[PDB]
Amino acid sequence: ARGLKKHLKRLNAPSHWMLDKLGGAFAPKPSSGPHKARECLPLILILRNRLKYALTYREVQSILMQRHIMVDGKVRTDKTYPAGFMDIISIPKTGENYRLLYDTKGRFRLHSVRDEDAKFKLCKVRSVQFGQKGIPYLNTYDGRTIRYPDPLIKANDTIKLDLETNKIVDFIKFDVGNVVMVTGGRNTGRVGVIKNREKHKGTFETIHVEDAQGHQFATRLGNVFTIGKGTKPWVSLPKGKGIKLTIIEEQRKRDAAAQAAAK
Amino acid sequence: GISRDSMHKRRATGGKQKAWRKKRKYELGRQPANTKLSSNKTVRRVRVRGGNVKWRALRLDTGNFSWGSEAVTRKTRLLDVVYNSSNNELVRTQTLVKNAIVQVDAAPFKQWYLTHYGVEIGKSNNVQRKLEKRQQGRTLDSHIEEQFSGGRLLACISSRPGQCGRADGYILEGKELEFYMRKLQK
Amino acid sequence: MKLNIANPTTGCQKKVEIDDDQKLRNLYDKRISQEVVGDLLGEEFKGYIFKIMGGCDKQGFPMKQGVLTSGRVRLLLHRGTPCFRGFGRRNGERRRKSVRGCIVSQDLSVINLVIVKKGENDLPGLTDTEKPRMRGPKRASKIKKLFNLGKDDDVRSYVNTYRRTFLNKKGKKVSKAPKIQRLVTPLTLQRKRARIADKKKRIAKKKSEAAEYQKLLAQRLKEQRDRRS
Amino acid sequence: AEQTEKAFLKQPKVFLCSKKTTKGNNKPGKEGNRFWKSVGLGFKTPKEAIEGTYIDKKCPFTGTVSIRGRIIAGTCHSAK
RNA sequence: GAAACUGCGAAUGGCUCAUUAAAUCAGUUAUAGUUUGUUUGAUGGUACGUACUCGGAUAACCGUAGUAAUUCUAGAGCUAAUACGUGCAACAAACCCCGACUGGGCGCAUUUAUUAGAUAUGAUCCGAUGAUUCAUGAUAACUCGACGGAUCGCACGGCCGCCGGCGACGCAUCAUUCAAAUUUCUGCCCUAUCAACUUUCGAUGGUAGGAUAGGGGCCUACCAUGGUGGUGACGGGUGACGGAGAAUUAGGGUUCGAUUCCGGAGAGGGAGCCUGAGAAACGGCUAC
Ligand SMILES: [K+]
Ligand SMILES: [K+]
Ligand SMILES: [K+]
Ligand SMILES: [K+]
Ligand SMILES: [Mg+2]
Ligand SMILES: [Mg+2]
Ligand SMILES: [Mg+2]
Ligand SMILES: [Mg+2]
Ligand SMILES: [Mg+2]
Ligand SMILES: [Mg+2]
Ligand SMILES: [Mg+2]
Ligand SMILES: [Mg+2]
Ligand SMILES: [Mg+2]
Ligand SMILES: [Mg+2]
Ligand SMILES: [Mg+2]
Ligand SMILES: [Mg+2]
Ligand SMILES: [Mg+2]
Ligand SMILES: [Mg+2]
Numbered sequence A: 001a002r003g004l005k006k007h008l009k010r011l012n013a014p015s016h017w018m019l020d021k022l023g024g025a026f027a028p029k030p031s032s033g034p035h036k037a038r039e040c041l042p043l044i045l046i047l048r049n050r051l052k053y054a055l056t057y058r059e060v061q062s063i064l065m066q067r068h069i070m071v072d073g074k075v076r077t078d079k080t081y082p083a084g085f086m087d088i089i090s091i092p093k094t095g096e097n098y099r100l101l102y103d104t105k106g107r108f109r110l111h112s113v114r115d116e117d118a119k120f121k122l123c124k125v126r127s128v129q130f131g132q133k134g135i136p137y138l139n140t141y142d143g144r145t146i147r148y149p150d151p152l153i154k155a156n157d158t159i160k161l162d163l164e165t166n167k168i169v170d171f172i173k174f175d176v177g178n179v180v181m182v183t184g185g186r187n188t189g190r191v192g193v194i195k196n197r198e199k200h201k202g203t204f205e206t207i208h209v210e211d212a213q214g215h216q217f218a219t220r221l222g223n224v225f226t227i228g229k230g231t232k233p234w235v236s237l238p239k240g241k242g243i244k245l246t247i248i249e250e251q252r253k254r255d256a257a258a259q260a261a262a263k
Numbered sequence B: 001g002i003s004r005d006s007m008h009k010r011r012a013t014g015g016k017q018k019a020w021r022k023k024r025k026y027e028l029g030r031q032p033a034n035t036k037l038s039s040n041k042t043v044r045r046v047r048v049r050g051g052n053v054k055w056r057a058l059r060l061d062t063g064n065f066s067w068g069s070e071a072v073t074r075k076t077r078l079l080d081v082v083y084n085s086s087n088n089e090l091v092r093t094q095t096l097v098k099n100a101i102v103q104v105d106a107a108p109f110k111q112w113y114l115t116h117y118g119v120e121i122g123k124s125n126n127v128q129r130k131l132e133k134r135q136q137g138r139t140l141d142s143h144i145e146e147q148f149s150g151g152r153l154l155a156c157i158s159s160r161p162g163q164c165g166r167a168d169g170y171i172l173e174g175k176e177l178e179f180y181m182r183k184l185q186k
Numbered sequence C: 001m002k003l004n005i006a007n008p009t010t011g012c013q014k015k016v017e018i019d020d021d022q023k024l025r026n027l028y029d030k031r032i033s034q035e036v037v038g039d040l041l042g043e044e045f046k047g048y049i050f051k052i053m054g055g056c057d058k059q060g061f062p063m064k065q066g067v068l069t070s071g072r073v074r075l076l077l078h079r080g081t082p083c084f085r086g087f088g089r090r091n092g093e094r095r096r097k098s099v100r101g102c103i104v105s106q107d108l109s110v111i112n113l114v115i116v117k118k119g120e121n122d123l124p125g126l127t128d129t130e131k132p133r134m135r136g137p138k139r140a141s142k143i144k145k146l147f148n149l150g151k152d153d154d155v156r157s158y159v160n161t162y163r164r165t166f167l168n169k170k171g172k173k174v175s176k177a178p179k180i181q182r183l184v185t186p187l188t189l190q191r192k193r194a195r196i197a198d199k200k201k202r203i204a205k206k207k208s209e210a211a212e213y214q215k216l217l218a219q220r221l222k223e224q225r226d227r228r229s
Numbered sequence D: 001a002e003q004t005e006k007a008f009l010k011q012p013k014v015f016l017c018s019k020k021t022t023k024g025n026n027k028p029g030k031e032g033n034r035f036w037k038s039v040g041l042g043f044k045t046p047k048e049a050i051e052g053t054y055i056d057k058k059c060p061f062t063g064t065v066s067i068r069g070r071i072i073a074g075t076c077h078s079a080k
Numbered sequence E: 001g002a003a004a005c006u007g008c009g010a011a012u013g014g015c016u017c018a019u020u021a022a023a024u025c026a027g028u029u030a031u032a033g034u035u036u037g038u039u040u041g042a043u044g045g046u047a048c049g050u051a052c053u054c055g056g057a058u059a060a061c062c063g064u065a066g067u068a069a070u071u072c073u074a075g076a077g078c079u080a081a082u083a084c085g086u087g088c089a090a091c092a093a094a095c096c097c098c099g100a101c102u103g104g105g106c107g108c109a110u111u112u113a114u115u116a117g118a119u120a121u122g123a124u125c126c127g128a129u130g131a132u133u134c135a136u137g138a139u140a141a142c143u144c145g146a147c148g149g150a151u152c153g154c155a156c157g158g159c160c161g162c163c164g165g166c167g168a169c170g171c172a173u174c175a176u177u178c179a180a181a182u183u184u185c186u187g188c189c190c191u192a193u194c195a196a197c198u199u200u201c202g203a204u205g206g207u208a209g210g211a212u213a214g215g216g217g218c219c220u221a222c223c224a225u226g227g228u229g230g231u232g233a234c235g236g237g238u239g240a241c242g243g244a245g246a247a248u249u250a251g252g253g254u255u256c257g258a259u260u261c262c263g264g265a266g267a268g269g270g271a272g273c274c275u276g277a278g279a280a281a282c283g284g285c286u287a288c
């Protein structure tokens, strides 16, 4: 009340952190970092609860202190560091370069990308204005800021950003006909192609997207993330990429029963 | 202490509002600086929210005043306070606040005018070949020029002395000046 | 009224207790930092002058410099000032304590005197006992200021004051010496050069990026050959 | 005139004593000019605000106040 | 490596529901009206008018004590800094002014004023919003400017003394994250045996200031007479913290909601305040 809060109750944790209700009174509060602490997956919830590498809040530390975790091309030790979207969690030694992608149910998935594809990432772009001494800068959506950007780059764009030599390799503008993945709300994790953008003077830029399998859905100007030019994404999607409503999930379970086992 | 809450005020319906909490620090107030025009300058540092610093000027004698028409800013000493829009006892007490009319000596401005326009009021070839160019458009208001002989120019304070610790301002000209002259003449 | 006599030059402290009113009247209106002649307060103090710089009441309450005629008053003292210590208190925390004014009177149970003038008559105690201390200063410039030295003649080979002779309980002779705290080594110069090199790297990168962005805008101007060609 | 108080009323950051001409200078409020702005949201600035002599720092068109938030329609109740 | 100095934390958590009936609170807004230790990314040329590295203290320690007394307290002698305080800031360019006939300014920060930020001499650069004199640039000056590394670890190397790596801590600006503060609209139980309430002394509005991190009668001077009300103001009761929710439920509904999740408020009752990025803090102080 008189200041900041350093505790996060388990029942107050974000939903995509599927945490057992009777597992404790507290959840790991995400540290300050590049991502918004509600759309992030802390490292504690990576070496635990997603991989069986660590078993407690004592071996996550025991393997972070060995400097074994390299997120976004940099060794990180803070166990509650907020890896939030498409961050390259590159585990050295064993080589587990993982892109944090959005499951069709709003979850977080560690898509195992190849090593040479793990040397870059992509970032969404916030406003672009003039800095001190009249030097334009980028100010992406994951805390990153890049000075001297190419003048074609504008707001809401996406940039393919290198890691070892941090410079913009190329970029995709925000326009209709581009692959887009939704990263917020109920439509999280659904890829599609923008059909038209509707503009309301004052607020609420609404984007209408067409799914590959024929479905259509709308969302805000936020929560969307351009992925690739035209209809070809620049990254490997985890699987499915379609909403897959409950009935067809039941059908998949049925055919899994009727095949494979089939007995 | 002094607070800025609406807690003690009354509703727009004229009904008394009760109290459900104590006073809070983040809504405090402080005593006014009550800056004075005096020769013994004194400015005291204040520590404000966030750890930043406010400069509370208790006494000032000089200032940074700008002639907008010629766009020249000079440091000069204030001589008197002649008008105060809000309170008529703030000129009797000679209190430096924003929008308070003051008088500043014209010596720096006379010196700049002489060395720039080549004209005194109140070298081989380049300087003379450039001086008449500035003398071609040289024009001054009669009310502006009549104060150089007197040695003091009417001016207005645009800074907040109790906040920035300084008294800067601009020289009164045009439609402003006579409006105050008709208020200062008697 | 007990007196704590301290020989600051090279001596020690001692307690002198006297009770006769005539001798203890001369120091009955003086204040802190006032001089008192030794003869007036008694014999054996001919060439001696004492300075008043302390004293406690009959209840242990201290004497605070700057307060008027002796009378117990209450002051809102700050931490770390005389007559108020910290030792487990919040940083910006004050406290109201009880002090007495610097004026000396009969309401004092002890008074601290320091010897200013050596005099000529000895005192058994704080006149012959010569004692060492910890090491001389461990700073670099405070060695060359103690052994008179020039710019050269490094102080590394100058610690003759090894505090030896602390013979170990296992019958082992080990020596202890401090560590110089401002000595210039090649490491410090390396750090200075590293800082300079970092500044050079920043100054180079800035102009490199500016030149490349100027080239990019030149290419954009070449692209502007398509608005109307 | 518009000056009906014990202080001169002027538009901030609008120099009223420049010797150079006007009436053709962009951003009205330059080289001596009434300062006015469009509030956006599809609202038209009245001609009485552009070609006006009043001074109002709380006016949305020729003042220091920007319109953002909620837009509400209603009827005037009391204008005294 | 004990102790001690220095830094950081103790403003989270825990407990309770007394006050509080458009007030807290819920959904939904706004900051173009602000502050933000910290985390992440980027960015630090002007000191010049001993730099192979400046100065004085002080704790632990040791020894003289006072008091019935307490992490009550006074003297003496030593000694450190990433404590405190000074000071080379190491080496530029561009530009703005005053100017020798054919020199001063200028890092970053602060305050004020002027000015560019266009339309949309043939060939002709110039961001952003629904919306700004906006982002930013140039200019004139201003400030007694806690700013612009006198700091630590590991590894040792390459050039004739020169140069050099990987880290730690620290200062400043911007963006981000963690947040708060204030704020838009709508919504609450019973009572008319509560019908007018508020305003000279702030009640509603205006002008100019003061104060605040910042908007605002938040406060001051002057001015105007306004503001709410049978669509229940004002006043009273509550054995009234608000919500998510609980019980019973054909449907509708009725009753409850101190309590583990969110928000608010309190540390016996009021008030004032220091430190700190953050408190009107009470396992902090001062007073009654
Ligand atoms: K603290
Ligand atoms: K609300
Ligand atoms: K305010
Ligand atoms: K602190
Ligand atoms: Mg908006
Ligand atoms: Mg400590
Ligand atoms: Mg709490
Ligand atoms: Mg009531
Ligand atoms: Mg309301
Ligand atoms: Mg601007
Ligand atoms: Mg105001
Ligand atoms: Mg009044
Ligand atoms: Mg109650
Ligand atoms: Mg409740
Ligand atoms: Mg209980
Ligand atoms: Mg609670
Ligand atoms: Mg409280
Ligand atoms: Mg009790």
Ligand SMILES: [Mg+2]
Pocket (backbone or CB within 6 Å): E282
């Ligand atoms: Mg309290």
Ligand SMILES: [Mg+2]
Pocket (backbone or CB within 6 Å): E283
């Ligand atoms: Mg307690």
Ligand SMILES: [Mg+2]
Pocket (backbone or CB within 6 Å): none
């Ligand atoms: Mg507490």
